[PDB]
Amino acid sequence: NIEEWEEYRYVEAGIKESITLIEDPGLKKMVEHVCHSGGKRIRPIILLLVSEICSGSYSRSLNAALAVEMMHSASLIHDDLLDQGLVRRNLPSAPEKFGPSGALLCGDYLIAKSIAFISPYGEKVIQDFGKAGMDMAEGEVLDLKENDYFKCIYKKTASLFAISASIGAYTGGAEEELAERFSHFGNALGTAYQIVDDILEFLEVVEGETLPHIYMKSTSKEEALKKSIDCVKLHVAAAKETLETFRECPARDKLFQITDYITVDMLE
C-alpha cells in the first residue's frame, strides 16, 4: 500500500498544487487526465526515498520529483500519439482520448514545465535530466525502427529510473560517487521493470518488440520465456545487491518493497 506512504502523499500534494497553476482550461483538463491514471508515482517516490537515505529528509526534493514525473507523463502522451496516429497511416484511425494536436502540445507543455521545476537544482542535476530526456527520444526512435532491444530499454525506460535515483541522491547532499551507485540501482530496477512489462505484453499477444519474441527467433517459446524471466531475476538481484550497500533505514526498506512490487510481484 504505497498510497499510504508519506512520500506518496507529498508527491500527490505537489501534483495537485501543480495542476492549480495551469491557466488554460483545456491543458488543465488533459494534465488532470494523465495524472488520474491510478499509477503509483514510482519514479518521483524513488527520488524522495533516495534523498531520505542520503540526508534523512526529502522536503527540498519535491520539485525534482515532480519534474521527473512530468517528463514521464510527457513521454506517455507523446508515445500514445505516436502509436495511435502517426505510424500506421494507411490503416483505420485509432481512437484517442486527446485530439492529436492536444496530445502533442500537452506533452510539450509538460516538458517545458519540468524545466521550470528542475531549475534550482544546479548544473549536474539539470544536465543529467536533459540527458535522460535525450535518451528517451533516441530510445523511442530505436523502438519504432538483440543489442538494439536492450539499448532501447536502457534509453527509453531504465534511463529515467537511473536519474530518479541519482537526482534524489544529489538533492540529499550526495557526492558524484554515491549518486553514481544510486544511478546503478535505478538502471537495474528500470531494466527489470521494462522486461517484466514486455513479458506481460508478450503473453497478451499469445492470448490474442518484446524480449520473449526476440529470443524465439532462435529458440522455443517457453525457453524464450524462461530466459526472459531469468533476465528479470538477474537485474532484480543486481538492484538489491546495490541497495544492500546503502544506509539501513525505512526509506531503504521501501526501496526494497518497490523493487519487488514492480518486478517479480507482477510475475505471479
Residues that bind its own copies (CB under 8 A): 23-24, 26-27, 78, 81-82, 85-87, 89, 93, 99-102, 104-109, 111-120, 123, 126-127, 129-134, 136-138, 140-142, 144-145
User: What type of residue sits at position 240?
Assistant: K
Closer residue to its own copies, CB minimum distance, 9 or 97? 97
Among 184, 198, 185, 256, smallest CA distance to 227 is for 198
18: left (phi over 0), alpha (psi -120 to 50) or beta: alpha
**Residue 242 annotated as binding?**
no
Closer residue to its own copies, CB minimum distance, 78 or 235? 78
Closer residue to its own copies, CB minimum distance, 144 or 203? 144
Place of cell 496530445: 103
- How many whole angstroms from its chain centre is CA 162? 9
Closer residue to its own copies, CB minimum distance, 85 or 173? 85
**Residue 259 annotated as binding?**
no
Grid coordinates belonging to 94? 485509432
Cα distance between residue 154 and residue 193, in whole Å: 11
Beta-strand runs (E) in 181-260: none
Instruction: Compute how many other C-beta atoms are within 10 angstroms of the C-beta atom of residue 99.
Output: 13
Q: What's the closest the beta carbon of residue 35 comes to its own copies, in angstroms?
A: 17
**Residue 194 annotated as binding?**
yes
Closer residue to its own copies, CB minimum distance, 40 or 60? 60
User: What type of residue sits at position 184?
Assistant: H
**CA-based angle 172:245:132, to the nearest 5?**
50
**Residue 72 annotated as binding?**
yes
Cα distance between residue 47 and residue 58, in whole Å: 9
**Residue 245 annotated as binding?**
no
Closer residue to its own copies, CB minimum distance, 8 or 129? 129
Instruction: Compute how many other C-beta atoms are within 10 angstroms of the C-beta atom of residue 110.
Output: 25
Q: What's the closest the beta carbon of residue 142 comes to its own copies, in angstroms?
A: 8
Q: What's the closest the beta carbon of residue 214 comes to its own copies, in angstroms?
A: 21
**Residue 108 annotated as binding?**
no
Q: What's the closest the beta carbon of residue 159 comes to its own copies, in angstroms?
A: 11
Q: What's the closest the beta carbon of residue 209 comes to its own copies, in angstroms?
A: 16
Three-state DSSP class for residue 234: helix
**Residue 191 annotated as binding?**
no
**Residue 43 annotated as binding?**
yes
Q: What's the closest the beta carbon of residue 14 comes to its own copies, in angstroms?
A: 16
HEC-encoded secondary structure of 8-47: HHHHHHHHHHHHHCCCCHHHHHHHHHHHCCCCCCHHHHHH
Residues making up the binding site for an all-trans-polyprenyl diphosphate: 88, 156-157, 194
Residue ranges of the annotated binding site for isopentenyl diphosphate are: 40, 43, 72, 89
Q: Which residues are annotated as a binding site?
A: 40, 43, 72, 79, 83, 88-89, 156-157, 194
